[PDB]
Structure formats: C-alpha cells, structure tokens
Design a protein around this ligand. Structure first.
Ligand SMILES: *[C@@H]1O[C@H](CO)[C@@H](O)[C@H](O)[C@H]1NC(C)=O
Lengths: 50, 50
C-alpha cells in the first residue's frame, strides 16, 4: 500500500521548563517575631544553613 | 560574588505597651480566705469571682 496524498498536521505539545523560585526565612517562620524564641533557634542555625 | 537572601536581625524592639481593663475594685480576698465558716468537703461551696 503506497500513499497517494498527504496531510500537514500541526501538533501542540507543552513542556514545563521551570517552577516558581522560593525563599524561606527560618527566623520569622519558626520564631515569628519573639526574641526569646529566636535565641533558642541559634543552636539549630546549622540546619537553616542547610 | 552574588545575591543572598538574608534572615531577620535588623529589627529589635525598644518599648512596651500594656492595655488592661480599667477596674479599681479590689477583689474579695477577705470573703473567701477570711470567711468565718467554711463548707464541708462533700457539700463544697463554689463562688463566682468577677
Ligand atoms: C483577715 O482577718 C485578719 C484578722 O481577722 C486580719 O488581720 C486580716 O487583715 C484579714 N485579711 C484580709 C485580706 O482581709
């Protein structure tokens, strides 16, 4: 079976390229605005540096 | 060299605010601690304080 005609088909495909960049502040997330809590968070500072 | 997100250290508090109800009535400490007669344990007395 040999074709005797043709069609020019345009297909659309979508690909995600990136996602929303995000940043997090340990101090104001965990220890919202209290100094007493933020002092206790210093010993865990390494974790946030991760 | 680059751009760095930073946590919160620049803000520090310096003043304090207190806001209680304005009441001048001393509370009946003499009517519960200095009461002439106390109740039996089985029929224990209950007093509202407001
Ligand atoms: C309780 O009673 C004693 C003597 O009856 C009196 O010295 C004292 O001031 C009274 N305390 C209060 C809080 O009323």
């Amino acid at each position: 079976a040999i074709p005797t005609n043709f069609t020019i088909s345009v297909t659309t495909e979508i690909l995600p390229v990136s996602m929303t960049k995000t940043s997090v502040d340990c101090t104001m997330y965990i220890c919202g605005d209290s100094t007493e809590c933020s002092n206790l968070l210093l010993q865990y500072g390494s974790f946030c540096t991760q | 060299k680059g751009i760095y997100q930073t946590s919160n250290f620049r803000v520090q508090p310096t003043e304090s605010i207190v806001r209680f109800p304005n009441i001048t009535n001393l509370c009946p400490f003499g009517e519960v601690f200095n009461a002439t007669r106390f109740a039996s344990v089985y029929a224990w007395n209950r007093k509202r304080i407001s």
